[PDB]
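Form P-L/3: holo structure prediction, ligand zinc ion.
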Amino acid sequence: VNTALQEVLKTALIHDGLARGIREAAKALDKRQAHLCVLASNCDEPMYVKLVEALCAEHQINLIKVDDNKKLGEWVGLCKIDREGKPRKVVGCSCVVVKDYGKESQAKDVIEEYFKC
Amino acid sequence: KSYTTPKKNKHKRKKVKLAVLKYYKVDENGKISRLRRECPSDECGAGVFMASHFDRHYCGKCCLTYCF
Ligand SMILES: [Zn+2]
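OUTPUT (holo model):
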């Protein structure tokens, strides 16, 4: 499912349906349009785990766990510069909400069937 | 350069870290609660909160202060 998450993140980046941060995620869940969400686990968060699943797991939540924030940060691309090799100075990303309009692709049906269970 | 008149700085934003802890609270269960009210204006968002001073408050885009 790693390639499915990669292609849906590429779809969100190519259609500008990707948003970064936790305050905008809070606004999206309070405004009741949050459909997709990706969480973080095994990170440098001291007591933020109970907080992030308390403010996340309300209703219709897909559980996606990323092992490292810094690996998540280069995956989202907070500082995606110097593409001819290694990025210069990246900082890891927190929990984000994916409000992407690209519901028709080669694996969006597979993603929705996996999240149906 | 250093003139006769002393230099006065602007409103520097203090690093109030972990302000997200002031947004919500966690009970024993998964339910959520807030200590800030909700602005009912259309120019304000459904999730946009309102400030907390000793007597009154302050909105965001609305900038309405409800006083009794
Ligand atoms: Zn307001």
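COMMENT: Chain B touches chain A through eleven residues (CB under 8 Å).
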